[PDB]
Symmetry: none
Subunit: 154 residues, 2 copies
Amino acid sequence: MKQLEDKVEELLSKNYHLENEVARLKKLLERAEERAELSEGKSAELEEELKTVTNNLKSLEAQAEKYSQKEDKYEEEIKVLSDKLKEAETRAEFAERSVTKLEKSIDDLEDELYAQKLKYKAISEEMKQLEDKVEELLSKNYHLENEVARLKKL
Amino acid sequence: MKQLEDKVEELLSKNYHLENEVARLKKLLERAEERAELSEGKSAELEEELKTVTNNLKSLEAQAEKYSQKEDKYEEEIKVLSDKLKEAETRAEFAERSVTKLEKSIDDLEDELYAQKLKYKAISEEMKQLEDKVEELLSKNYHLENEVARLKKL
């Protein structure tokens, strides 16, 4: 029995050991659980961050869609203004050259009209001298006729 | 002793449940450690995803910035072209209206020259009739003067 009494002394110790092992396993278990909890929590916050960023992205993609379009609009707008500008500068350039030419034409017509008028004035003056001559002769003949009659009565 | 018997029996039963608890906890620990690993792996994968989507968003923002300034560029070009077009159109219109004015003046000058030539023709015609009248009266005058001379010497 002195051997059996020593057995009880062992089971007590070996049980003391099992107890310590149980406590150790429980501490490690809790550490694993807390690790998993911290990570699952981080994933959740990251999940949220991914949706937020992804949304913001699908928006810039869309904005970029409107940006590219306006670009082609502006391009078409500029094109039209350029072609209008060219056409107007051409109309201007040519019309101005026409003005100079037309003014010279007017100078020539005026020179011609002036000369024509000078000619008219001169023939008019000639007419007046001829009229004065007719008047002068009608008078001379009226009196010569009376003189011819007077002489016949002498 | 019967007493020791019972003591041993108690410790063995206790020892039994303890061995089973250690075996059970090792199993739960194995599973909790696997869970943590898996969760930590997911977090790392999500973190890398967020970094990538973030780098893309930042890239789209840079682009969006170039569009905004290049947009103000196109805007500036249009205003520049617009002001020039207004200036060109005004000068074009001015020169073209001048041309219309000068053409109308040329037409009026042609009308006057035509009318002036008809006047010259009309006066030249009277002139012809006047010269004929003078020739006739000079004739009559000539014969009358001769008749007076003749009568005076009888």
